[PDB]
């Protein structure tokens, strides 16, 4: 019915589409350049495999983007909205995990599913983000 709409070719295409956006549709999932930037920032914070909080990754974003002067960094609430977008497509998951500091404390531990190799393609094509790899 796609063949109809255009008035087994396209089935490999639709498989590469629906199964894993990582193939090509991740670029759609991270359409905005700030989305890709924040995603690579998460990947950078992954070097500190700790509670990838809003705060941890946010401060990491702040420092790494003061370093790489691509753009004035986003607001706290802005970073919240961006990561929520990233979660809507599901490319990166979050979980309100419990820490025991004061009471049962519920902070966003996130986990990214992407790999730097699947970042190799999707970043080396955009030489503007590459200043941050």
């Amino acid at each position: 019915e796609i063949y109809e709409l255009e008035k087994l070719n396209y089935i490999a295409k639709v498989f590469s589409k629906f199964v894993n956006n990582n193939s090509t549709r991740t670029r759609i999932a991270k359409l905005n350049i700030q989305q890709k930037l924040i995603l690579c920032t998460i990947i950078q914070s992954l070097k500190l495999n700790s509670d990838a909080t809003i705060d941890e990754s946010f401060d990491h974003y702040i420092k790494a983007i003061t370093k790489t002067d691509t753009l004035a960094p986003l607001q706290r609430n802005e970073f919240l909205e961006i990561c929520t977008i990233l979660e809507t497509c599901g490319l990166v998951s979050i979980k309100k995990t419990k820490c025991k500091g004061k009471t049962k404390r519920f902070v966003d531990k996130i986990d990214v599913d992407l790999d730097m190799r699947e970042f190799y393609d999707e970043m080396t094509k955009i030489s503007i983000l590459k200043p941050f790899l």
Binding site: L71, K130, P131, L133
Partner: protein, 191 residues
């Protein structure tokens, strides 16, 4: 830290065995000095007492400052050499003075103290990786972008009329077609 490599255990071992063959480590291009007359020249140098040059001071000073600041942001970090002291500065000066002795000259060179700095830093980062990288070579449009970023540091506007930008681009030498292409890309990139 002796990284167990292959070319070392090749060359070093070969050349020790070559010492067993030829009792002189000096190869085809080498001037080994017998320790007696070596000592003679060394003492002669020791009898010189050169003077500190006035120009290098600032540089020297600045070096210290650098060697200071990093140290703070490296205290708890990996290379835990903690809080380089004024004695480090004084030792650098002394090393420069001794190299000037090796020059047998009474004025320390900027290359002299630079070599001293090279000695003091080669002592560092000799722990792990021992490598770096470079990314900023290409810059065919990113350079324009950084110029724009300095301009934004000045005022910070995403205007729709570019007249100082095009002037500074022409001063930079980059053409106007590439500039307009990049402007297209960044407007589409939403900046």
């Amino acid at each position: 830290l002796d990284i167990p490599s292959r070319d070392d255990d090749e060359k070093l071992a070969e050349h020790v065995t070559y010492v067993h063959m030829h009792n002189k480590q000096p190869d085809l291009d080498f001037t080994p000095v017998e320790p007696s007359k070596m000592r003679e020249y060394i003492a002669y140098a020791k009898t010189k007492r050169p003077v500190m040059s006035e120009a290098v001071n600032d540089y020297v000073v600045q070096a210290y400052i650098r060697l200071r600041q990093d140290s703070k942001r490296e205290m708890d970090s990996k290379f835990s050499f903690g809080q380089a002291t004024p004695r480090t500065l004084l030792g650098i000066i002394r090393l420069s003075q001794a190299l000037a002795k090796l020059r047998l000259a009474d004025m320390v060179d900027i290359d002299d103290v630079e070599e001293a700095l090279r000695l003091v830093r080669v002592s560092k980062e000799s722990l792990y990786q021992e490598t770096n990288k470079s990314k900023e070579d290409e810059s065919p449009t990113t350079k324009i972008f950084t110029i724009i970023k300095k301009m934004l540091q000045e005022t910070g506007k995403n205007t729709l009329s570019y007249e100082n930008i095009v002037k500074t681009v022409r001063l930079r030498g980059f053409t106007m077609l590439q500039l307009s292409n990049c402007i297209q890309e960044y407007s589409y990139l939403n900046v």
